[PDB]
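Notes continue from the previous slide.

Worked example: a multi-chain complex. Inputs as given:
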Amino acid sequence: SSKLLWATEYIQKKGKPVLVNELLDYLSMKKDDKVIELLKKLDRIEFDGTFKYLSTYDVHSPSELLKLLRSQVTFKGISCKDLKDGWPQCDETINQLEEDSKILVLRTKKDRYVWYNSGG
Amino acid sequence: SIRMPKKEILDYLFKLFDEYDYWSLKGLKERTRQPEAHLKECLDKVATLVKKGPYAFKYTLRPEYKKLK
Amino acid sequence: LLKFVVRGFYGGSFVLVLDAILFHSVLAEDDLKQLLSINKTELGPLIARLRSDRLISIHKQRVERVYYYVKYPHAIPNGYMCPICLTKYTQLEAVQLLNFDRTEFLCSLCDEPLVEDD
């Protein structure tokens, strides 16, 4: 568990594709279990033969950029439904929630609650 | 006393360890200019050590009995 | 008028809400908030104030949607704002609030000259 958590944390911080061995060094953990259990069932681990981390977006800037402009203008509601409606390309459910949390910051809440996003 | 620093310092380690599973003493001081002896005593109770090829000093928060996370 | 009657009853902040609605078709707090650029939260509460008065009516449906409409029939750029009753209007309201006698857009409730709201 500890080793796996360190591998996930490492890949998450470093965020790149990498052989099993390459991962051991930086995190120093090796087991067959990793090859045929951990780095296959773990959702955060994306097999591309080597093991990569499940990036929110190919570029971080693309959803965060729109969210910055939307805050300068318009209303916060319908964050995933307004983002998908916006362009033909489809935004990933997790990349959306993820960009927003890293970006935050705080949101004006009013009582369920209506949430509006403003610049800090 | 400095226990405030200890508890508060552990928070800094989690942030550091949140980005990478391993950290050497040199990387920890950059994150905290607190006396290494002071950090080492904390890492000694819950941390671990590992020497490698060139003897890379790396520490890891032992999760074996960490009731606090 | 409808605009005046509301004012007598409640604050000005409310009046701005009623105006946008008069301005366009039935809207939702989100929309009324989006065009206006006011917090949705304050918007909802403005709606209730007027609603008691019957400036607007609400329909709730089994996210759930709420629609707001002004009970006008009951009684019977592209983003400008008024400096007097602090109301607001968009482009669809510009082709109607515009005046040749002055060459600008005039409010609709307090006839005050409006100005683009950034």
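Summary box: The longest strand of chain A covers residues 107-110. Chain A is about 50% helix and 10% strand.
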